[PDB]
Design a protein around this nucleic acid. Structure first.
Ligand code: MG
Ligand code: MG
Ligand code: MG
Ligand code: MG
Ligand code: MG
Ligand code: MG
Ligand code: MG
Ligand code: MG
Ligand code: MG
Ligand code: MG
Ligand code: MG
Ligand code: MG
Lengths: 247, 138, 199, 190, 109, 176
RNA sequence: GCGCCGGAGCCUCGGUUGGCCUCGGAUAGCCGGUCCCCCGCCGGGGUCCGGUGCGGAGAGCCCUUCGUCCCGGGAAACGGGGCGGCCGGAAAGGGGGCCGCCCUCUCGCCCGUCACGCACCGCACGUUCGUGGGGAACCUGGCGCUAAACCAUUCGUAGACGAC
RNA sequence: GCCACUUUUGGUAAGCAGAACUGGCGCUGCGGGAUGAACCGAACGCCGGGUUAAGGCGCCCGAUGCCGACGCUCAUCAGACC
RNA sequence: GCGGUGCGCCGCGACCGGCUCCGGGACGGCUGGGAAGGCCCCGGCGGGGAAGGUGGCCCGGGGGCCCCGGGUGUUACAGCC
């Protein structure tokens, strides 16, 4: 027999493998679609959730009851120290997808970013990129690692810069700096890469990524609440008091 | 557009069947897909024959659609079809097709020894011509 | 010892019915450019058939349900493994010798690829019937790489024409050299013409 | 029944230079060129006669469902000759009961904004077809003139702006408003 | 100094749909694809040649690893030039879709 | 009867057995179209049982012989009057064919009505076959071959002999 | 104690028995030229010339292996084989072309002349890709490498336990 | 006890109940009907060679990879074997 | 040397016989004492008929005398019955 009383189903099936996220850093599944008309700009940034507070502002929407009245609105502070760019990576469109092509790192990268390549920074001897950084200080390597920019300016469609947070400046216990590919959306691929190889091993602040009163998207992992029950997770109806094996 | 038309009096080479390899002449188109043919000078008897087996040459010889084999032979050897067929590039590349099938082992050896030198002489000429064109470019 | 089949203008199951048998007879088959496989019947019947195949998901776990491959090469792969006995290990060792490719990748772009006349649209459909492109069907049933593979194939065509112009040039140098050499290869040619190779 | 042969000649006039590249035709004359490939139609197009005065379409061994496509080819060639000699002027009139249909022409004949249709505030922006020039005719108060070479472009750009002006959820037999195709003639005459 | 055996693929056993008879091999000889062409190969010697681990003795030579199973072609099989053969020990199903060398030497020319 | 192969055309005569009522019966002749003389003699005692009060037991085949066609090198027109059974009802017909032999047109008639009407050979009866001169012909699918200047190409030569070259380089040509 | 570059063998897994180095594509139409002509950065198109049961043919092309010895003819000489530089590669990257050098050869290819090479005595898996893939231990040298992971401790943005 | 051709009773009808003739299944494998107590072929000691039946011969899958013959058929629900 | 018996293992060839599948030749019988067709503008001499009408004649168009349609008619510079 059917349901006597129809009712919409609990939960959404679009978010269905409700598992622990494999990543701690929120990952951008799709950067904004590129077009060669606009000037070059980063399209993502990282920040840290500080907390919540109020706002009072005067609203200007002609038609509401709250035009030229003043609401309060909850807001969230995200501390965003300027992120240090430490590499680029290119991507070639393939019939099987979009393959990475040639990752090129900077010369001097900081040892808060070097923490990321080590599961145990104490026991290690800090040997990462030591044989790689010596390519920047000889002509045998300089003509090697600018010939590949010349191949990235031929065969890559998507150039994504490779930045990292600067966790020296944060109040946290952690020092291992998160790092992120940020897609550079701008002119041709030559302009797009000869913009970022000067941003290589230097700062990028927030104010030349975003602006005021712009809508953005927040990527991140939720506050974990543990192994919880079906009425706590899926919000199904609590069975009545009289039930024998739990309600 | 089209160049070979099935009509009264076109010579047709025959692909397969019992009379494969013989020219024939269309007398009268019986149906959509079968036709009354004969070759009075190529040893193939007056009969019907479908269009699935006959390939059309560009030879028309003129005789009426009810004419008998006595008068088809006259318009055959008038136009002299049997020598014009052997002079065609068609029959030369069916005759050179069957010479390679007739080729024995000693003939296959002699052909191998001939082409082993003839390709080398051609290639030694071609790689003189290539650098001659390159010195012309230079 | 590796058979490279073209895929343009071949009927889907009519090509698969002989790819399956050459694969079972131990012959390593790589078919290529499965974009231009065309299916008979019109496009709307074929799209309705593939959407009906998309409707066939296992009710309790569609992840365990039938994997509806959207790429044209893997549509052709699944329609070969329908024809192969893929449960048995000879069918599994058969499917390991079929290698499908969307477009023509660089292992096989500079290799001469073969055409089956016995599975081909202009031979096995009468010309007033209307067929259906597997590339367009796979695209607007959810294969994401039509335009990418189309630009890469256009890049391959504008380079294969550079190859073919040089091949024409070499053949013209050859047939202009042969008249220069016909006085000294007059007796090397004559024994070829008497054995049916150069007339 | 397969008939053995159907054909139908088309007399091309003096000023028209017609040519045909295999099965794809090109008709040239005063106003321009029109090209329309018949690569679906499976016939024999032959440009017989020196001085090149007639096109002749042949169909060999055709049943009636594909013999129907002979005067179709002849009529597309005749509408292809007409749109290069004379052109295609479709005049179409805006019938309005109460609210005036305010048509303004933008992008020098390529875009039509239709306003105030039944007093609605949504404006119909309809793009024309490449080769068609819309205009508001003088010496007649509300009449649009669509002129061009291809009849399938002129008539389709007429039907687009005619189906852009429809009523919704009302008695169509009473709310008889909209732009409708009134006269189907040539641009210049003979 | 060259090759002296025709190429053949061991297609399967002589089989009905629900029954196979392992005392008769189906050989698909490369090049012949019709019964008017399979006339030459009747009664020819043929061999399934395979390597293994332990050394066998090779006639006319030192012990190798390569072993054989000999047999002869018996009769044609269907219109596509497929042919039947019988080997003196029945073929393992390992050999399905591998290369049986069909000899020339019981020659009838 | 099944219309096996090509049909042959038989002149079968027969009569009932002599009785003291009538010592010499009249002899009856039919054109029986049949794959062989055994089924020809069976169709004879089918039709003569439908016509006369005569059966195989009280009668005999006086002469069963294949009547050969008298001009098999002239293309001729044939009119065949017919009688067959549909899924519901019996229909009289008149079909026209164009062939070399009188029995070739009949074996074309059986394969045409099996094609078009799903009429099987036991259901089809055959009553008259006439050689018809080209003025008295009235079927448009036959009369279109009645011109002295007949002319047509063979436009779309579909490739037969497909699996003989099976894997080639060249695409097969179709225009010849 | 590891990676790379340049020797004898052993164990194991087995399959194979010459390569085809590529236009796009039409199919009621194609292929190859010529350019005398018209525009573009050599390419497109017209004209004309050839093919079109495809012969600039996958019914096809290339290579062809018994060896050496002399002497002659035909072919080569600009070629044959061996060291430094210029380019050709991204969809899953090209052991290809070119410029030099110090060497070297009238050798190779096609006809002939001359005789030799276990002629192993009629008999099977021979003939290759094969320096095959993998696995250990032996060899001698050259130039280079000296790491991370996991547990234990801690954290609490995570947590049934692991995991993070 | 059950099923099937044809004859047949009750019942709207039934993979229902009740008869007659004969053959089956049960007691019975095998080839075919994908699948299957009964249908089509065929009944069995253990094997080699040949050949068939019913049914098949794109591929699973032995066999049409015949240059098979003549037509009909377009289905945005095609059709496909007691 | 003869006769019997077998070879340690793996193989081959020859002829004879049985049982089968297939190929290549060759001859004869019958029928409507085969039916048709082949050879003697050509089976002969006279007679006839039309058409899926050859000449020719006329009209029309594509022309540079040829080709293509349409009409007439009965052997002509084709043939058929
Ligand atoms: Mg409900
Ligand atoms: Mg209780
Ligand atoms: Mg209302
Ligand atoms: Mg070996
Ligand atoms: Mg009962
Ligand atoms: Mg009961
Ligand atoms: Mg019993
Ligand atoms: Mg039984
Ligand atoms: Mg069933
Ligand atoms: Mg029965
Ligand atoms: Mg048996
Ligand atoms: Mg079956």
């Amino acid at each position: 027999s059917h349901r006597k009383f129809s009712a919409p189903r609990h939960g959404s099936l679009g978010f269905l493998p409700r598992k622990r996220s494999s990543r701690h850093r929120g990952k951008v599944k799709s950067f904004p679609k590129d077009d060669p008309s606009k000037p070059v700009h980063l399209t993502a940034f990282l920040g840290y959730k500080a907390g919540m507070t109020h706002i009072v502002r005067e609203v200007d929407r002609p038609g509401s009851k709250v035009n030229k009245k003043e609401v309060v609105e909850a807001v969230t502070i995200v501390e965003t120290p300027p992120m240090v760019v430490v590499g680029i990576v290119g991507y070639v469109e393939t019939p099987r997808g979009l393959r990475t092509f040639k990752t090129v790192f900077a010369e001097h990268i900081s040892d808060e970013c070097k923490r990321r390549f080590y599961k145990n920074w104490h026991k290690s001897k800090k040997k990462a990129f030591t044989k790689y950084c010596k390519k920047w200080q000889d002509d045998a390597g300089k003509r090697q690692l600018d010939k590949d920019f010349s191949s990235m300016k031929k065969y890559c469609q998507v150039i994504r810069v490779l930045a990292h947070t600067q966790m020296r400046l944060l109040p946290l216990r952690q020092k291992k700096a998160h790092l992120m590919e940020i897609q550079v959306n701008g002119g041709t691929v030559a302009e797009k890469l000869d913009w970022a190889r000067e941003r290589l091993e230097q700062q990028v602040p927030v104010s030349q990524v975003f602006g005021q009163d712009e809508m953005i998207d927040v990527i991140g992992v939720t506050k974990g609440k543990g192994y919880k029950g079906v009425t706590s997770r899926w919000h199904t109806k609590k069975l009545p008091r009289k039930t024998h094996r739990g309600l | 557009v089209f160049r070979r038309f099935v009509e009264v009096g076109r010579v047709a080479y025959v692909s397969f069947g019992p009379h494969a390899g013989k020219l024939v002449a269309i007398v009268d188109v019986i149906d959509q897909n079968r036709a009354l043919v004969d070759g009075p000078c190529t040893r193939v008897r007056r009969q019907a024959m479908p269009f699935k087996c006959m390939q059309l040459t560009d030879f028309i010889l003129k005789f009426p659609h009810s004419a008998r084999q006595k008068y088809v032979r006259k318009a055959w050897e008038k136009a002299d079809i049997n020598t014009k067929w052997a002079a065609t590039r068609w029959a030369k590349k069916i005759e050179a097709r069957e010479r390679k099938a007739k080729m024995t082992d000693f003939d296959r050896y002699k052909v191998m020894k001939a082409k082993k030198m003839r390709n080398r002489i051609i290639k030694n000429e071609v790689k003189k011509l290539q650098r001659a064109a390159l010195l012309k470019a230079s | 010892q590796v058979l490279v089949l073209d895929g343009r203008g071949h009927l889907l199951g009519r090509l698969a019915a002989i790819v399956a048998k050459q694969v079972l007879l131990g012959r390593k088959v790589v078919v290529v450019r499965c974009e231009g496989i065309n299916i008979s019947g019109n496009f709307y019947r074929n799209k309705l058939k593939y959407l009906a195949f998309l409707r066939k998901r296992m009710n309790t776990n569609p992840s365990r349900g039938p994997y509806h491959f959207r790429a044209p090469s893997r549509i052709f792969w699944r329609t070969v493994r329908g024809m192969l006995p893929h449960k048995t290990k000879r069918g599994q060792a058969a499917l390991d010798r079929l290698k499908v490719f969307d477009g023509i990748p660089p292992p096989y772009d500079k290799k001469k690829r073969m055409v089956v006349p016995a599975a081909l649209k202009v031979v096995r459909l009468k010309p007033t019937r209307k067929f259906a492109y597997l590339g367009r069907l796979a695209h607007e049933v959810g294969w994401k790489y039509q335009a990418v593979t189309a630009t890469l194939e256009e890049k391959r065509k504008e380079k294969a024409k550079i190859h073919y112009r040089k091949k024409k040039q070499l053949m013209r140098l050859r047939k202009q050299a042969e008249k220069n050499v016909e006085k000294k290869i007059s007796k090397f040619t004559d024994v070829l013409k008497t054995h049916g190779l150069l007339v | 029944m397969k008939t053995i042969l159907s054909n139908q000649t088309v007399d091309i006039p003096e000023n028209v230079d017609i040519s045909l590249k295999g099965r794809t035709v090109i008709v040239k004359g005063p106003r321009g060129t029109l090209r329309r490939d018949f690569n679906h139609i499976n016939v024999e197009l032959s440009l017989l006669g020196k001085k090149k005065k007639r096109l002749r379409v042949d169909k060999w061994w055709g049943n009636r469902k594909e013999l129907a496509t002979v005067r179709t080819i002849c009529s597309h060639v005749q509408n292809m000759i007409k749109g290069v000699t004379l052109g295609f002027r479709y005049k179409m009139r805006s019938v309005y009961a109460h609210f005036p249909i305010n048509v303004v022409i933008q992008e020098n004949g390529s875009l039509v904004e239709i306003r105030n249709f039944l007093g609605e505030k949504y404006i119909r922006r309809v793009r024309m077809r490449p080769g068609v020039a819309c205009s508001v005719s003088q010496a007649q108060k509300d009449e649009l003139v669509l002129e061009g070479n291809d009849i399938e472009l002129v008539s389709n750009s007429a039907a687009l702006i005619q189906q852009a002006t429809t009523v919704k959820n009302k008695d169509i037999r009473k709310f008889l408003d909209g732009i409708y195709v009134s006269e189907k003639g040539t641009v210049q005459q003979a | 100094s060259g090759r002296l055996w025709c190429k053949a693929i061991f297609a399967g056993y002589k089989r009905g749909l629900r029954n196979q008879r392992e005392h008769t091999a189906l050989l698909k000889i490369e090049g012949v694809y019709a019964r008017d062409e399979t006339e030459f190969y009747l009664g020819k010697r043929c061999a399934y040649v395979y390597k293994a681990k332990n050394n066998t003795v090779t006639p006319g030579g030192k012990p190798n690893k390569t072993r054989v199973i000999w047999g002869k072609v018996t009769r044609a099989h269907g219109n596509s030039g497929m042919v039947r053969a019988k080997f003196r020990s029945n073929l393992p199903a390992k050999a399905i879709g591998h290369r049986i060398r069909v000899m020339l030497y019981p020659s009838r020319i | 009867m099944k219309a096996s192969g090509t049909l042959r055309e038989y002149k079968v005569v027969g009569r009932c057995l002599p009785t003291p009522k009538c010592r010499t019966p009249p002899l009856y002749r039919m054109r029986i179209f049949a794959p062989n003389h055994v089924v020809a003699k069976s169709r004879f005692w089918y039709f003569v049982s439908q016509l006369k009060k005569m059966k195989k037991s009280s009668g005999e085949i006086v002469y069963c012989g294949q009547v050969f066609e008298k001009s098999p090198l002239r293309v001729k027109n044939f009119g065949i009057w017919l009688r067959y059974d549909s899924r519901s009802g019996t229909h009289n017909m008149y079909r026209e064919y164009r062939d070399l032999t009188t029995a070739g047109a009949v074996t074309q008639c059986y394969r045409d009505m099996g094609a078009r009407h799903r009429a099987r050979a036991h259901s089809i009866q055959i009553m008259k076959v006439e050689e018809i001169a080209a003025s008295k012909c009235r079927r448009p699918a036959v009369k279109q071959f009645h011109d002295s200047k007949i002319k047509f190409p063979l436009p779309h030569r579909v490739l037969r002999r497909q699996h003989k070259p099976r894997f080639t380089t060249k695409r097969p040509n179709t225009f010849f």
